[PDB]
Amino acid sequence: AAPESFDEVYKGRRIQGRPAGYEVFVDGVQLHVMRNADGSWISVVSHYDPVPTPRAAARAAVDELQGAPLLPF
Amino acid sequence: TVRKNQATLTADEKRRFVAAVLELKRSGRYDEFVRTHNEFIMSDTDSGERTGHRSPSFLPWHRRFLLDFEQALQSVDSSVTLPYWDWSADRTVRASLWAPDFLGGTGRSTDGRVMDGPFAASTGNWPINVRVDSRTYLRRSLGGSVAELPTRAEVESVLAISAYDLPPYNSASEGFRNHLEGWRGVNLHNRVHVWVGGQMATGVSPNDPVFWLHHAYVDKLWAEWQRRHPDSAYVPTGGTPDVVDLNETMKPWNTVRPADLLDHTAYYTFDAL
Numbered sequence: 001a002a003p004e005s006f007d008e009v010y011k012g013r014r015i016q017g018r019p020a021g022y023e024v025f026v027d028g029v030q031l032h033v034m035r036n037a038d039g040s041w042i043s044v045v046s047h048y049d050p051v052p053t054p055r056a057a058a059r060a061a062v063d064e065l066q067g068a069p070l071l072p073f
Numbered sequence: 074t075v076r077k078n079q080a081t082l083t084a085d086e087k088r089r090f091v092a093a094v095l096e097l098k099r100s101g102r103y104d105e106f107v108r109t110h111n112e113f114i115m116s117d118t119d120s121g122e123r124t125g126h127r128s129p130s131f132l133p134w135h136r137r138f139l140l141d142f143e144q145a146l147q148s149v150d151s152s153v154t155l156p157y158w159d160w161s162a163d164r165t166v167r168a169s170l171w172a173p174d175f176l177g178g179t180g181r182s183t184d185g186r187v188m189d190g191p192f193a194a195s196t197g198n199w200p201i202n203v204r205v206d207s208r209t210y211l212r213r214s215l216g217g218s219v220a221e222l223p224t225r226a227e228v229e230s231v232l233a234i235s236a237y238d239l240p241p242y243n244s245a246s247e248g249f250r251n252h253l254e255g256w257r258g259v260n261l262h263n264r265v266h267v268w269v270g271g272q273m274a275t276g277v278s279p280n281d282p283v284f285w286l287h288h289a290y291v292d293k294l295w296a297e298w299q300r301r302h303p304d305s306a307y308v309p310t311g312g313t314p315d316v317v318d319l320n321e322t323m324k325p326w327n328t329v330r331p332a333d334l335l336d337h338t339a340y341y342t343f344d345a346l
């Protein structure tokens with residue numbers, strides 16, 4: 001089963017997630033994310049650092065970006 | 074071809090390595106290595122085709138990727154070889170690796186920007202082009218996101234694992250390859266990416282020249298594992314969906330197999346193994 005969708009403003013940035021196998025967006029720009037076999041998640045800007053959920057991966061991307069626009073993949 | 078511990082390079086060898094890397098950047102060749110690595114880490118998945126990461130071919134794939142990069146360096150200066158970073162030994166920000174005559178240091182706290190060394194954005198010689206984070210300067214936060222690099226005792230515990238890899242041949246596996254990669258256990262290779270931070274924590278991690286020195290030491294650890302376990306070898310050995318078996322070719326080259334890459338000494342030796 002895929003995780004639930006989410007939508008919130010995190011550190012001033014709109015993060016959205018939805019099942020697709022799952023998509024995340026940061027201010028409307030899609031962010032590559034991936035699920036590991038143990039159920040953890042990573043994003044392309046944190047791709048060696050598992051976190052428990054796609055929202056956690058989106059928040060890790062906002063933390064990584066330090067305010068900068070994401071560019072599309 | 075001898076791959077040397079970075080800590081041992083002469084000032085001349087550091088100068089020549091840096092100039093060769095800067096020339097691959099200026100000529101446009103460097104950024105295509107960055108692009109190839111990001112394309113594989115976005116496509117390598119635990120339940121589908123997986124080649125460069127989270128799979129038994131993680132190690133031969135990165136061995137061939139580093140060989141391609143070393144050959145490109147040698148096309149600029151034939152005396153240059155890839156050095157390796159033993160992060161178990163050279164484990165602080167004071168390491169000579171991070172000095173201004175070599176890779177430069179950590180980034181400043183506000184925006185992660187590396188401010189010294191030859192790859193600092195202010196030099197004009199190290200544009201970050203292939204990127205996901207839109208910022209165009211090299212960034213690092215050494216020890217920011219995880220507090221310690223692996224220790225020698227931790228590396229030893231992974232080296233002692235007898236099986237090369239095990240079904241299901243992905244990030245959930247037991248065995249040496251996944252413990253070295255780091256998705257299970259005390260975590261060697263992934264933790265080093267996270268410890269450097271900046272681009273090294275992302276799919277475009279070859280944007281930092283330390284990428285190559287990190288993976289040259291990972292590659293050395295494979296060589297040490299083999300010497301510890303001469304009775305053990307690459308697996309799987311045929312018929313495995315979505316996984317590169319021993320005698321199967323690997324993308325993107327298509328013309329080389331794990332079997333062709335197990336013996337590093339056909340291509341280089343280490344200063345000490």
Ligand SMILES: [O-][O-]
Binds near residue numbers: 135278288
């Ligand atoms: O290997 O990144």
Ligand SMILES: [Cu+2]
Binds near residue numbers: 032034044116
């Ligand atoms: Cu991915």
Ligand SMILES: [Cu+2]
Binds near residue numbers: 114
């Ligand atoms: Cu990688």
